[PDB]
Design a binder for these strands. Structure first.
Ligand SMILES: [N]C1=NC(=O)[N-]2=C([N]1)N([C]1O[C]([C]OP([O])(=O)OP([O])(=O)OP([O])([O])=O)[C]([O])[C]1[O])[C]=[C]2
Ligand SMILES: [Mg+2]
Ligand SMILES: [Zn+2]
Lengths: 897, 862, 159
DNA sequence: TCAGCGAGA
RNA sequence: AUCGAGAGG
DNA sequence: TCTCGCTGACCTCTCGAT
């Protein structure tokens, strides 16, 4: 009778609304509340504002027979990562709303918006103990994705710190010598000295000795009144240079990181509380305000607009000149308008920075302007450069109805009025921005696949004893070192003894965790490349070990046994896409190589042809360009296109004519196969190049030192150009194309395929400004490489070529070698995260994930048995997970009696 | 017919052949989609009912009869009535109206949906349908769309948009002939306007109508390009032609990004009417149209002189020219008073006219909710200071002065309807009498002798409104919990054949007597004029009056068509006033929004040199991160308007001659670079000028049409006229210390709205309660008093933490372990808390469901 | 610049620059026009209940020479007005009174004239009425039926 | 809807 | 309970 | 090698009708 089809028996087991995903993986719970969240600036990190109306009900059985002795868990709706649930000690407040600490707002993505959070009460004693020891906001100083602190001053606090620590020329009280920070505070409160007055103060600072003791150093330092006042809350053991500068968001983040590294946990939380209090107080005292006059419209825009309009008019030469094809015209118009947009943004920023000309004691000096928009910009509290240039420059280009960009520019900012046509154009960008958070968030929510493919991994032993590792090198693609060698190696063990430049001297012995001091020692040496112990080349079966993993990023020190590294890695990788797609509407819907230092031209992997003129024209498709200075080779990596011809300009080409983000990340994680790649199979050294009558040119590659040759078929149409590429390495490029991860694995190796996947994912993540540690991607790749085909098993029980767990094959080979048997040979198989998750031994996990009917049919016909050893199985059957606190219980269960 | 016309036009015109010929040789375009309104859908449902009736008639008449076949027995009205009843009440397009404010009703009535029967599906729809199209210009608002999955699919009609005979949206354009714009208007559809080139509204024109600029910006073929005067064929009729009604209410819309304009247009619809409607100081000029067309305000049907004024009713004495020959000459306008809304808000009409005041046709006589003198008033003008204040406006939060709470500027009345239904039961277990078993003396005395509560009584939680006992456990209707209020209305419903108890007869007859007295008074008010005219057919008039009174009494006493199985229904209306507190969502018209975090004492708020504190403190960091500069511009313009109003009020406080007030108000109205409005005070009389100045003493309202609003120079001039700084920023002093803030702070009056997102409606906390049947899990709603869902992502978070015992207790002890729950509650209450988790009942449900599929799944012991 | 008495009490200061040549139309004109087309008498069978009746009114047996017809229709006065419909919790509807007609012809004699014609007026269900504000009252709740954006009937060629 | 996936032709 | 229509995050 | 089904695409609240 109803229009919708009837729900059958299988419909109640499979799907999002099925039994698994709606009642076993996620349940509704008692002792839970919810209300709107408001800001409490008086709260400490371990505190939150819990209304008495809730506390009367949530603690009702406790009341029958309490707030301070029993913590509560606060929870925001998305919960993109672990810090979306934290434990606080509640203080009873009047009203209905919940008071949330301002610092944990970034960790929760919380906002005083109408936003709501849930409350949960740990009932059992063990639940309270684990809440206090693990989920407390004080224990969550550092982010799990990367070692950066997750609690950070923002908005009002950043503006207050930036107002205090900034200086002004000829401010009241300039040039006076002060006996300490207290005198500076006294002159500020008395009104005798300004907060930006450049004074000379006597500062006593402490620095840790060799044994760790604190020794004081007293000296007179050129500073300001605000910095001197701020120095009073800085704990003992930090240099004065941290506050002797205009503090932005990055400066405060670095200061908090330094405090955590030098002092520890409790000093860091105390320092964060003091910084928040001081920032709020001095942002209130500053009286910062935004006005229509604060946005200054430069006179350069009125000419740059005309220049760009004339440029595009000349570029489209009345459609009679030719080459007005839609591909070329659109690209050149977009390039011209982007050039105009960046020129106007630079012009307005330059007008705003030195808008203030200040009269000194008889001098008309120029200093950085105290404009409100500018002070909100460089402080980094809130407000990107794109938004500011939209306000005071132009809007620029907008998102097309399609994925492309509008041809027509807005050519107007928001301080000035917009035409109805321009506003109609910007409505397209508005629709795209809201549609990204409305629909594209499903693509991010990748996260579930990553969680399920990797949820089985738990750190199980201290160390393998292995020696394998991966090369770590800096990234200099963009003309600067985007990822220094310290960022890659920090907090990870060393597989091989790092040797000092030269020989017989080792800076870092192997099997030592490279913490901040070891990284500084490595940076003392001019150059260093370290082979780092990794998780993909981990000898542990059924898990990973602490040494091959590295350091617990959230806790700083080395990771302990029992930590679910797979879930943490999956959450860390999955969050940035989800968070960035949501923040798309914040924006509003909006040819040569030049080296830093001149020198002689060097090249790497380059094949070129001599042009008719003296210039050199590149012929190879993949060519890299690196310059050498008068002192050494310049540290950049650049890509030279096929048609390119060669502060010195060393390359020239036309990007227009040749003579995705999360989709790309998913393609890498699903082990997609590109159509083009064709690379050498086995190292031979001789290519026969025999003549074959068949249309597809046939390649026979025969070894110099081996009798058995290899023959391959190379279609001429599919692969137009074929090189020699002999015996350099099995996997050498024979035809031009994007390399396939499966072939790259099979030919080069596990380490090489891991490096390829990690680099290709991190390029996409870095393009958007996201910073995630590489060990998470390495964990995910390790989950990708779990199946092997046992070719030529011999004495093993495997029959012909069948997919088998790599751990089982390795254990069988070890047992056979103990008994003297030859063992089974195998080839590692690369499986996408979906297929690898569906191919797990347990059928309950596969049924819960996806393909429920098919998985159940396979398990039923095959008579499979599930041992319930992973996290998801024990969650479903409602027992303790084999991780964290329950890891000891699960190990006791495995050891049995 | 429209389909045949489209088929002929597409092929430039055997029918199947022509389609194949052109196939061998954009759907989102408006020319491919037409509008289907309520009338056509009702006609289609009538067609469905009528074809069902026709099938029934054919089946009945297939037998054939000589003289025994008649129209009556052949047809039956049941299928048609069933079909129409299903359409009006169960159709997807038949929606519960949004009744938060007049603007919400206007937007709902002007709403256009691409979904519905014979339409698209939100999950199947792609990006092409959801995106703006060049044909949306002037027909569908590009700004106002839902923020959820319904984006792009649910759309709002533009201000000037119509529908032609064929159902295609069309827009008005000014015909341009020989280079001069002509006042004649031609409505053009998308396919019709595609051929023509259309000039823009922002095109300067001379006195004769010629375009000022040599080259005029235009559009053609879906693209905008510069054009000369000769080629121009049409011009936009207004600058509001593109935006909808809701989006046109935003002042300075061209200074906002379309995202924040969308947010403001949506949040204008959740604004709750307050105790006093306060006009927007800065507006657009569309408030009057919205208020009049919404129908919430009583509008004089005929022009006349007011004869009687009252809170509940207004009487108009119609003019001699406007009376019908048979008409007595009296128009009575009864006013809605404290009635519940669809969204549980209050509907109130208050007269805005005085006795003896002349009235013409179309004048507003009473002000509906969120209306002030015929102008839509969705919020209150508030003095805002854009500056951080100790982190109490930290992250988009809002700090509110205690004077706002004291003056009840944002206090709202919310009416809650509770119903008590008595059903028929064998052996008479259920009772409805006042006497109930095990009832407190105070609770019994609270209810009347009829068992119902008295009108006007104050009721708190756990108090019975209507007395009832059933077996006999008390089935009395009572307020659920927490909710408190006063009984403003009680309605008792009984069927014609339903037995009426004497006490229930007493209550129902009291209500009916009140209604009959009201009706008799209303009839006698009109009959008095006719009787007086007869004094200057008395028996006939008396007989007609008696007949009308008897008919009204019969209509009042007519039994209601109660549902089968129930005897009487008693409805109790509770009205309570909600005062703002920390946790209430506040927002403006430019996309800005926030939650009150603290109620700050009046002395602690920042104050000016004159000692006047600010009402609202807003973080300035939320302005440049977003792209809502319109809020800053509106703040400056509101400051200037309040300065003008303050000057007028100052001249009113000390007695000033009417000449000075006339001169100042004329100067204020004449200010502006070039304004079409020409207010001439020389035409007005002295009393009219005094009344205007009295209305302007709280601030002169300002109208800024979208894409045609006030320039910055005009705002600066208005600030100058009010003796205020042109920068819009003033020196503020800290209330707690008296120390001047180191930088000037912009201060002005911004129109703030209170949204229907109160914290008391949202605050919830459950310890334990009812559990579902199929799965022994807590319920899933605040109304059902259920727990919060602990989704899979939260389980992932606990797994990442390694919190094994917390996750185990949340999976089993807090849900699905019936024995575990039962033992845990005793353990927690006793104070020695220990849990023994077991198998969740959901796992057993899964096992049973899998076994019912034919697959044997078991629990292997070892 | 204020002529109405309501606007004369308080004139809003207008900063607009562009002259207004076409006044804002009635905001709810679409609902009123649609329901007026649906309800009002149509001399031709193009729109409304008239067009609806001309579709399936001629219900008769196959080749029986006895068909059912009608002459016109009329909508009666509603029993209750909007306010007491909302109070009572009942639909605000108007009874539909339709005058039907039936014709009887000679059996197996098509050439012969019609034996008799029977016309009579019959009540046919309740049709809900829309108030002056463009809304409907259904079961005591005030409802709005929004317009639908659907593809125009005809032929289109898309890939 | 829109993809991607292997397995029949 | 389910479905439809909305809304907030 | 290429069609061809089969698979996939967080939390909360309000209302009424079945
Ligand atoms: N899973 C999921 N699907 C969704 O569709 N949406 C989600 N979550 N949110 C949550 O709410 C935050 C943004 O909401 P908003 O209104 O506060 O926007 P905003 O930019 O952060 O601040 P503002 O409104 O002041 O401009 C966002 O992170 C997320 O947690 C909102 C929509
Ligand atoms: Mg928010
Ligand atoms: Zn290891």
């Amino acid at each position: 009778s109803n229009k919708r089809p009837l729900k059958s028996l299988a419909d109640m087991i499979k799907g999002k609304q099925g039994r698994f995903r709606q009642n076993l993986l996620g349940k509704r719970v008692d002792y839970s509340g919810r209300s709107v969240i408001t800001v409490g600036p008086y709260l400490r990190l371990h505190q939150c504002g819990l209304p008495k109306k809730m506390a009367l009900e949530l603690f009702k059985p406790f009341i029958y027979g309490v707030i301070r002795e029993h913590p509560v868990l606060l929870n925001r709706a998305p919960t993109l990562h672990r810090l979306g649930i934290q434990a606080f000690e509640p203080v009873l407040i009047e009203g209905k709303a919940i008071q949330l600490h301002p610092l944990v707002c970034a960790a929760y993505n919380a906002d005083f918006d109408g936003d709501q959070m849930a409350v949960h009460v740990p009932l059992t004693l063990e639940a309270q103990l684990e809440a206090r020891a693990l989920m407390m906001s004080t224990n969550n100083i550092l982010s799990p994705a990367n070692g950066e602190p997750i609690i950070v001053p923002s908005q009002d606090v950043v503006l207050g710190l930036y107002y205090m620590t900034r200086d002004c020329v000829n401010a009241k009280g300039e040039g006076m010598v002060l006996t300490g920070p207290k005198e500076a505070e006294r002159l500020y409160r008395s009104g005798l000295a300004s907060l930006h007055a450049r004074v000379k103060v006597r500062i006593t600072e402490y620095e840790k000795d060799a044994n760790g003791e604190l020794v004081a150093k007293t000296s007179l330092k050129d500073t300001t009144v605000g910095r001197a006042i701020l120095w009073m809350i800085v704990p003992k053991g930090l240099p004065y240079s941290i506050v002797n500068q205009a503090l932005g968001k990055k400066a405060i983040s670095k200061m908090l990181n330094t405090c955590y590294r030098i002092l520890g946990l409790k000093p860091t939380v105390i320092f964060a509380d003091q910084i928040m209090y001081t920032g709020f107080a001095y942002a209130a005292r500053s009286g910062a305000s935004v006005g229509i006059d604060d946005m200054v419209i430069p006179e350069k825009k009125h000419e740059i607009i005309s220049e760009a309009e004339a440029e595009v008019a000349e570029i489209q030469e009345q459609f009679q000149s030719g080459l007005v094809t839609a591909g070329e015209r659109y690209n050149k118009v977009i390039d011209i308008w982007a050039a105009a947009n960046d020129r106007v943004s630079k012009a307005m920023m330059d007008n705003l920075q030195t808008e203030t000309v200040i009269n000194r004691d008889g001098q008309e000096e120029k200093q950085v302007s105290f404009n409100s928009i500018y002070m909100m910009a460089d402080s980094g509290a809130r407000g990107s450069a794109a938004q500011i240039r939209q306000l005071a420059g132009m809007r620029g280009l907008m998102a097309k109805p399609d994925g492309s960009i509008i041809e027509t520019p807005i050519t107007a900012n928001f301080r000035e009025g917009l035409n109805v046509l321009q506003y109609f154009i910007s409505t397209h960008g508005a629709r795209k921005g809201l549609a990204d958070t409305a629909l594209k968030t499903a693509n991010s929510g990748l996260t579930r696949r990553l969680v399920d493919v990797a949820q089985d991994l738990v750190v199980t032993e201290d160390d393998c004893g292995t020696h394998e590792g991966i090369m770590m090198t800096p990234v200099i693609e963009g003309g600067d070192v985007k990822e220094p060698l310290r960022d890659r190696v920090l907090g990870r063990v060393t597989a091989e003894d790092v040797l000092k430049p030269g020989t017989a001297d080792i800076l870092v012995p192997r099997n030592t965790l490279l913490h901040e001091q070891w990284c500084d020692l490595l940076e003392e040496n001019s150059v260093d490349a370290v082979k780092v112990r990794s998780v993909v080349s981990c000898d542990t079966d059924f898990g990973v070990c602490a040494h091959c993993y590295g350091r617990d990023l959230a806790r700083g020190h080395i990771i302990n046994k029992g930590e679910a590294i797979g879930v943490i890695a999956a959450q860390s990788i999955g969050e940035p896409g989800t968070q960035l797609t949501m923040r798309t509407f914040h924006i509003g819907g909006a040819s040569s190589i030049q080296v830093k230092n001149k020198g002689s031209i060097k090249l790497s992997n380059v094949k070129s042809v001599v042009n008719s003129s003296g210039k050199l024209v590149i012929t190879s498709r993949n060519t890299e360009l690196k310059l050498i200075d008068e002192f050494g080779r310049t540290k950049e990596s650049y890509k030279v296109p096929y048609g390119a011809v060669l502060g010195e300009t060393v390359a020239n080409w036309d990007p227009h004519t040749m003579p995705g983000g999360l989709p790309r990340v998913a393609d890498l994680f699903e082990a997609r196969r590109p159509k083009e790649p064709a690379i050498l199979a086995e190292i031979s050294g001789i290519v026969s190049f025999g003549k074959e009558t068949k249309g597809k040119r046939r390649l026979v590659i025969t070894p110099v030192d081996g009798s058995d040759p290899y023959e391959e078929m190379i279609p001429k149409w599919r692969q137009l150009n074929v090189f020699e590429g002999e015996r350099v390495e099995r996997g050498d490029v024979i035809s031009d194309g994007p390399e396939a991860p499966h072939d790259i694995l099979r030919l080069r190796g596990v380490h090489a395929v891991t490096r390829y996947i990690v680099n290709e994912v991190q390029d996409v993540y870095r393009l958007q400004g996201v910073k995630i540690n590489d060990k998470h991607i390495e964990v995910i790749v390790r989950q990708m490489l779990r199946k092997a085909t046992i070719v030529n098993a011999g004495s093993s029980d495997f029959l012909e070529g069948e997919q088998v767990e790599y751990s089982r094959v390795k254990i069988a080979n070890r047992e056979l070698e103990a008994n003297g048997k030859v063992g089974a040979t195998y080839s590692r198989d690369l499986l996408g995260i979906t297929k690898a998750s569906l191919a797990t031994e347990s059928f309950i996990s596969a049924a819960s994930f996806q393909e429920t009917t098919r998985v159940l049919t396979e398990a039923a016909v095959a008579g499979k048995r599930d041992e319930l050893r992973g996290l998801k199985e024990n969650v479903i059957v409602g027992r303790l997970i084999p991780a964290g606190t329950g890891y000891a219980y699960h190990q006791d269960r495995m050891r049995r009696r | 017919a429209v389909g045949r016309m489209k088929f002929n036009r597409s092929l430039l015109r055997d029918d199947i052949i022509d389609v194949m010929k052109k196939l061998i040789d954009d759907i989102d375009h408006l020319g491919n989609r037409r509008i289907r309104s309520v009338g056509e859908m009702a006609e289609n449902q009538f067609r469905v009912g009528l074809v069902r009736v026709e099938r029934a008639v054919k089946e009945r008449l297939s037998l054939g009869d000589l003289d025994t076949l008649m129209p009556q027995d052949m047809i039956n009205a049941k299928p048609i009535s069933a079909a129409v009843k299903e359409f009006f009440g169960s159709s997807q397009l038949s929606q519960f109206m949004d009744q938060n404010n007049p603007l919400s009703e206007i937007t709902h009535k002007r709403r256009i949906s691409a979904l519905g029967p014979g339409g698209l599906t939100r999950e199947r729809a792609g990006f092409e349908v959801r995106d703006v199209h060049p044909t949306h210009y002037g027909r569908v608002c590009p700004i106002e769309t839902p923020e959820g999955p319904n984006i792009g699919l649910i759309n709002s009609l533009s201000v000037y948009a119509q529908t032609n005979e064929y159902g295609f949206l069309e827009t008005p354009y000014r015909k341009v002939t020989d280079g001069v714009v002509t006042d004649e208007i031609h409505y053009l559809s998308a396919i019709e306007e595609g051929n023509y080139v259309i000039a823009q509204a922002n095109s300067n024109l001379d006195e004769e109508g010629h375009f000022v600029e040599d080259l005029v910006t235009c559009r053609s073929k879906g693209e905008s390009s510069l054009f000369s005067r000769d080629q121009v064929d049409y011009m936009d009729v207004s600058t509001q032609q593109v935006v909808s009604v809701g989006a046109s209410l935003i002042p300075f819309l061209e200074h906002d990004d379309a995202n924040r304009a969308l947010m403001g247009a949506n949040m204008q619809r959740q604004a709750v009417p307050t105790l006093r409607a306060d006009k927007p100081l800065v507006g657009t000029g569309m408030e009057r149209a919205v208020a009049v067309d919404s129908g919430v305000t009583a509008v004089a049907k005929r022009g006349g002189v007011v004869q009687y004024v009252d809170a509940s009713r207004i009487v108009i004495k119609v003019n001699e020219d406007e009376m019908y020959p048979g008409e007595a000459g009296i128009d009575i306008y009864n006013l809605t008073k404290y009635t519940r809304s669809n969204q549980n808000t209050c509907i109130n009409q208050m007269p805005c006219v005085s006795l003896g005041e002349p009235v013409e046709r179309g004048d507003v006589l009473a002000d509906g909710p969120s209306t002030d003198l015929g102008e839509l008033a969705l919020g209150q003008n508030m003095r805002v200071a854009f500056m951080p204040w100790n982190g109490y406006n930290f992250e988009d939060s809002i700090l509110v002065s205690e004077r706002v709470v004291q003056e009840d500027r944002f206090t709202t009345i919310h009416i809650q309807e509770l119903a008590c239904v008595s059903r028929d039961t064998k052996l008479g277990p259920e009772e409805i009498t006042a006497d109930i078993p095990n009832v407190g003396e105070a609770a019994l005395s609270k209810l009347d002798e009829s068992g119902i509560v008295y009108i006007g009584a104050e009721v708190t939680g756990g108090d019975i409104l209507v007395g009832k006992v059933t077996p006999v456990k008390d089935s009395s209707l009572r307020v659920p919990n927490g909710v408190s209020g006063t009984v403003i209305d009680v309605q008792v419903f009984t069927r014609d054949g339903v037995e009426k108890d004497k006490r229930a007869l007493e209550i129902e007859e009291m209500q009916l007597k009140q209604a009959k007295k009201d009706l008799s008074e209303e009839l006698q008010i009109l009959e008095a004029g006719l009787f007086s005219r007869i004094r200057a057919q008395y028996d006939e008039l008396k007989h007609e009056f008696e007949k009308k009174l008897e008919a009204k009494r019969r209509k009042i006493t007519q039994g209601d068509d109660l549902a089968p199985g129930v005897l009487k229904i008693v409805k109790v209306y509770l009205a309570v006033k909600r005062r703002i507190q920390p946790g209430d969502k506040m927002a403006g018209r430019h996309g800005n929004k926030g939650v009150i975090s603290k109620i700050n004492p009046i002395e602690d708020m920042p104050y000016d040199e004159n000692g006047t504190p600010v009402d609202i403190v807003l973080n300035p960091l939320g302005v440049p991160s977003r792209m809502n500069i319109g809020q800053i511009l509106e703040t400056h313009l509101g400051m200037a308007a309040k300065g003008i109003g303050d000057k007028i009020n100052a001249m009113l406080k000390q007695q000033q001659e009417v000449a000075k007030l006339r001169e100042f108000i004329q100067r204020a109205y004449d200010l502006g670079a070039d304004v079409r409005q020409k207010v001439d005070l020389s035409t007005f009389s002295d009393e009219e000028v005094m009344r205007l100045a009295e209305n302007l003493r709280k601030g002169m309202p300002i109208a800024t049409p979208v894409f045609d609003g006030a320039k910055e120079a005009e705002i600066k001039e208005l600030l100058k006229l009010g003796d205020l700084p042109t920068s819009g920023q003033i020196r503020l002093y800290d209330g707690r210390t008296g120390e001047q803030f180191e930088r000037p702070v912009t201060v002005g009056y911004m129109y703030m709205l209170k949204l229907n997102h109160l914290v008391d409606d949202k605050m919830h906390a459950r310890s334990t309660g009812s559990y579902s049947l199929v799965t022994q899990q807590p319920l899933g709603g605040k109304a059902q008093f259920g727990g919060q869902r602990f989704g899979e992502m939260e389980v992932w978070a606990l797994e990442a933490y390694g919190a094994a015992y917390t996750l185990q207790e949340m999976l089993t002890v807090k849900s699905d372990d019936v024995n575990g729950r039962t033992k845990m509650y005793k353990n927690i209450v006793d104070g020695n808390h220990q849990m023994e988790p077991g198998m969740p009942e959901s796992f057993n449900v899964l096992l049973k469901e899998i076994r019912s599929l034919g697959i044997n799944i078991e629990l292997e012991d070892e | 610049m204020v002529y109405s008495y309501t606007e004369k009490k308080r004139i809003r200061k207008d900063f607009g620059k562009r002259p207004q040549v076409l006044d804002v139309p009635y905001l709810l004109s679409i609902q009123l026009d649609s329901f007026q087309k649906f309800i009002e008498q149509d001399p031709e069978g193009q729109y409304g209940l008239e067009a609806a009746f001309r579709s399936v009114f001629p219900i008769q047996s196959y080749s029986g020479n006895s068909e059912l017809q009608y002459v016109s229709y009329r909508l009666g006065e509603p029993v209750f007005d909007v306010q007491e419909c909302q109070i009572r919790g009942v639909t605000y509807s108007a009874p539909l009174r339709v005058k039907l007609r039936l014709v009887i012809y000679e059996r197996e004699a098509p050439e012969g004239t019609v034996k008799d014609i029977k016309e009579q007026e019959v009540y046919m269900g309740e049709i809900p009425l829309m108030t002056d504000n463009g809304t409907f009252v259904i079961n005591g709740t005030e409802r709005v039926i929004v317009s639908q954006l659907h593809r125009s009937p005809g032929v289109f060629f898309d890939s």
